Write a protein that binds this DNA or RNA. Sequence first.
RNA 1: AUAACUCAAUUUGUAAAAAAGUUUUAGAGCUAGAAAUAGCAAGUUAAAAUAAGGCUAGUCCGUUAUCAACUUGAAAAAGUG
DNA 2: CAACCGCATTTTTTACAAATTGAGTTAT
DNA 3: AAATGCGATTG
Length: 1322
Amino acid sequence: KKYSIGLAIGTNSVGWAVITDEYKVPSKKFKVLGNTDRHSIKKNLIGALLFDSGETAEATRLKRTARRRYTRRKNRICYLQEIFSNEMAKVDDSFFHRLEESFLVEEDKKHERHPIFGNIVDEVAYHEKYPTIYHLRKKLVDSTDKADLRLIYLALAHMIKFRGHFLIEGDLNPDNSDVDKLFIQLVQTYNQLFEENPINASGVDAKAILSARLSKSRRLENLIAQLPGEKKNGLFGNLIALSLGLTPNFKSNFDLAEDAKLQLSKDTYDDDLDNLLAQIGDQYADLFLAAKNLSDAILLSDILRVNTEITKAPLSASMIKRYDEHHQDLTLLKALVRQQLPEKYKEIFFDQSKNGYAGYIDGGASQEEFYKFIKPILEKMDGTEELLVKLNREDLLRKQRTFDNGSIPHQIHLGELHAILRRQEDFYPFLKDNREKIEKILTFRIPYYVGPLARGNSRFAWMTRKSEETITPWNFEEVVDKGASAQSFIERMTNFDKNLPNEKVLPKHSLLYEYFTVYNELTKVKYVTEGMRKPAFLSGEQKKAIVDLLFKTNRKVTVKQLKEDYFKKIECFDSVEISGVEDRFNASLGTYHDLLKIIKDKDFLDNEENEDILEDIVLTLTLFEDREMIEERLKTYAHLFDDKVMKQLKRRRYTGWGRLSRKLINGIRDKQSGKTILDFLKSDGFANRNFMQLIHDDSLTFKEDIQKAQDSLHEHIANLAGSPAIKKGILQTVKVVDELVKVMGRHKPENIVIEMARENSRERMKRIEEGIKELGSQILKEHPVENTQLQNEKLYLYYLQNGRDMYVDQELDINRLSDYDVDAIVPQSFLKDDSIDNKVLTRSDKNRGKSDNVPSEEVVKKMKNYWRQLLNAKLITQRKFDNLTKAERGGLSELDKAGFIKRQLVETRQITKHVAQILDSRMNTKYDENDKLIREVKVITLKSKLVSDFRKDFQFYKVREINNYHHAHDAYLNAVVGTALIKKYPKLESEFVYGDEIGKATAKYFFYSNIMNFFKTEITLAEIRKRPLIETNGETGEIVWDKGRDFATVRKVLSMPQVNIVKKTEVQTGGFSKESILPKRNSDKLIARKKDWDPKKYGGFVSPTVAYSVLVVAKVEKGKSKKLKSVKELLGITIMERSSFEKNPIDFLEAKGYKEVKKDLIIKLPKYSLFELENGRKRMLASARELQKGNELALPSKYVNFLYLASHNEQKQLFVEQHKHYLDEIIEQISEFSKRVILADANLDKVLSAYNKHRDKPIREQAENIIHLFTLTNLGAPAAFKYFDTTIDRKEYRSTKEVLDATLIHQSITGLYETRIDLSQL
RNA sequence: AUAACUCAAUUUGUAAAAAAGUUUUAGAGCUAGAAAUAGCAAGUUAAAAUAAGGCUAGUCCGUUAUCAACUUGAAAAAGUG
DNA sequence: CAACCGCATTTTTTACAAATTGAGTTAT
DNA sequence: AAATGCGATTG
Ligand SMILES: [K+]
Ligand SMILES: [K+]
Ligand SMILES: [K+]
Ligand SMILES: [K+]
Ligand SMILES: [K+]
Ligand SMILES: [K+]
Ligand SMILES: [K+]
Ligand SMILES: [K+]
Ligand SMILES: [K+]
Ligand SMILES: [K+]
Ligand SMILES: [K+]
Ligand SMILES: [Mg+2]
Ligand SMILES: [Mg+2]
């Protein structure tokens, strides 16, 4: 009966309201179930559901993949030990047993406590000879004497267990030996090519300074310092930078207008270098060759700090170096500290809590914190200089297992492994027989395109089996079908053709697909000359000409190229106008030219008989990215081109998929024509019909063939694109609407109004680092920053703009930001954009020019080049750039302005439209005699601006900190305003409801900018106007608004004290506990990490999280007698024990000690369960041992508006000064509330005192802080707050005893239905 | 409002990998003195676990989504004022 | 007991698909 | 990245 629903959808809330034809919210009586006094209770139909945020699947994913990593590493070790098992059984009966029981205490061990050899003397001997595992590694690599099998194992297992990364393909083979001759060779060739001016080797110690432990940049700087008359930006400088691993740019050297940047580790190096050499002349090739030849002996200089002539183990040897220098410098540091500051020796070398050397080795101090702690001790001392030198290089007292070993490629560890196996296979036959297996254990790696090696029980797996063997690293290629697996990896994610749903989409770089795009764009190009009377299409012949002559010879085709190279040359038109394209064609035959460069056979690419082949090739190049498998897939075409061409095709790789199928573009045929879609795009006579037209033209049969070709609420919502949080909001919104419908007797509403709320330091620091380094700027060396600092908006913009004004061509001052202006590129009055994309730092905003538009044309002229530099450094995005420059395109036209304004009130967000479609499809389910949908319910969607402006305009002020009522209030107001709008302007249905020259632009602007004026009585537009007291619609005359009564109605609704705020109860899920592993200590609070690892002996976890609490009434044994005592208490069931408890609850509880459990009184109490006690005082159950505040403080509207105005028109100021007494009154309110439900006496006293101490402060400040006070009374978890400078610590409630005798309240989603249980009765 | 294309930014979801960290144990502490307690010597490494665990036993799975109460259901979700 | 103070696994790389937003060309 | 449920210290 005559009601509409208002809905405010948030990430943590859904406000809901029900309104009647005159904007009142009903008040109904609802039955109360349970064993309580109340049989019913009256409720207003307004409220809000609150809930914790929905989470992404990310954390779960990281955990799952980490899991798989651990189990596979374990299996690696197991494979190794299975190889060693028998021959180790002849040396040491129990070696592996001692290894796998090493973690146990002596009390629990089966065997002697010394793992390696099993006796004290031999193990002390071992650790004396090999203080680190790398000593053993190196000796086992270099030495030729037979070694103990157990040590061999320890070496191999250490290398397999920490095998390094896989970011470099192929193999490395360290050769640091000829860096001097290689540098001299580069200098040599360069001097051959530049006979005119040579560089002189000059005994420059290239080895020392390139293999130095600095960064590539500094090594460059220093190295080119030693070369006279040469600059780091010159040719040889850029070359050196290349040999180092940096990406330089060579265009300024070769007078090139096109960027030429080369990175020797990028897989595109061969073709970028071929590009460049084809531009500059191949006589330069031997230069870049030298760059590689050096780059190879120098690649790994940062890990291998040792001559490769002394060892085959440069890694283990460099680690031994770490150890020895650590030793020497430790002895020295000790001596020094003894001499000069002995009183500080203890703190440094004993106290583990201080971050000294003791804290460094035995405490929890990191190398960084240790260096930071001991830096002043060193530079203060004497005899220390080299230790500071080692400190700034981060090389002082290094361990061997360190955060920075992530640079080690697996090829190194593989080198040493191969070496050891080669040494000791001479003595152990089985090592020879199993050399390859072992190397494979270190080598093998499941390809990402295979996924888990599942067998029907992984929801995540997709791989397929060529055979039903158990899969090992040695039978992987024979048992796993890698081709089918790599196929499914992509085809399980790729879209099908929506027009032909049983057809797969073509590769985006398919030749056919690009012909389709080129022709689909070209077929709507029109042209005019002087003679003709109308613009005409291109004919089939003309299109084939434009394609064969321009598109198949130029990578990109410009309009100029079309006017000069076709129209002028082939049609003798000195002038012509082009209508269907701007500047240059968007589509292009990129793949045609890629394959032209590789295949060098244009007639092959033009031959239609090869179409299929070529498609299949580009499919392959797209589907797979493992070059080995691409080769396998291209073999069948190995006869069509020479070997080298096959070599180059291998490396050609494409990514991406289109939107349409091959059948669609060139498969389906028109019955009448016999022509495919592409046939029509190529030639369609006088009508040059589009893909869109072809697919919808009833004279052609494509559409009918397509139509011929053509689930639950929760899956549907989960399938949407968007934040899982807002999705949680959406589902909850649908369930709310369902309940309200039921509340209204299953009558559906007249309208449903929905509003959706809109909407990091490391990312920033990275942005600036890469953009600055690309920009060749020093501002980072000049002004060092730290991640967190860049949360400052103005500092971030300062760095994004290279410390420069964005509208003027002058520098900025880091020390003067407070004096500068942040300015919106397109002003805020049109685009409500707060992000960096629309903001700029400038000395003063006025120098942008006009305030009503894009930055003026002067500015564009003066700063355009600089903005381009920022774009190419990615320090601004394309959006920001185009917006900045729009004044050279007339800036903001009037139409664009009207556009922005209606975009401010009309919701265009896709996810919101999905919400509206869900609701519409749930509410409107019937079809009229003509099979058209009957739209009984109208779903309106509004942007936040309407209700916000409404609140400001009519002083229905909002303060979100006082309580949660504002969610509900917003929902109510959305219902009111939405229904009023649609009642007043029914045509605007098309704009706001779901379902199916320049002067007019100004009219739209003014119109949408004044749409909300039918609410006011007098309006000033910036002359005055006036409006009646009663607002109707003209055509119907129906009353839409009545300013005599309706505003007062709103005030009555906002003032209502009882508003149904419901915190959603939720079983907690996720981690069993905190992840930290604490040391052993006596406490039942420590949870075993494994069944048999008693934490009193081994330590364990703390803080398990309660999945849900349970009410238990039973008896407990008491004292030695074990006399049974009746109890009623709350037992937290932890996530880890939940499944056990649900399997059999009586056995679970009995094991916990409870006897004679009354099974029918067991009550599941998830987090946030609601309980009432005493004077309406409420608590929410956050845990089994802690409670949260459960009450809302309904502050009178007059105080809400007062606080709003005081915290921030002469009349309203007068109101503040006239009603200052409200302050004291407000506090009275709070005080009462607290003394009645918060029960935090001390904290309340500190509030009263701290306030009385600030009754002489400005009223603005006092109000702003009274607002702070409300977190003392807020619903939910207690929290700390500052009144002024008086920090009030939180007073939380950690008992939950009272709850057991309170009234439990089971709430509906709306809270309107309640079941109340008097727990006193149990 | 839809569809294809261009350029760009963002978000979601997935797989394969790396390095640390932590926790027990092993790296014979030494002299004094009865005892705590002093004095000095040392330290850098390794094994193993890294959600307890599960059955489907895979080199798989185990932290997302979804959840008032009562009656019905496996479950979804229905029926109840 | 209540007030009070402390604590919480971290980081790095590769490969891939789909939406969505927002500036453009063409169409239903 | 908080903040909020818990651990332990203390008063
Ligand atoms: K024993
Ligand atoms: K120089
Ligand atoms: K440490
Ligand atoms: K370590
Ligand atoms: K264009
Ligand atoms: K590919
Ligand atoms: K061939
Ligand atoms: K959950
Ligand atoms: K959670
Ligand atoms: K991503
Ligand atoms: K509920
Ligand atoms: Mg495990
Ligand atoms: Mg470790």
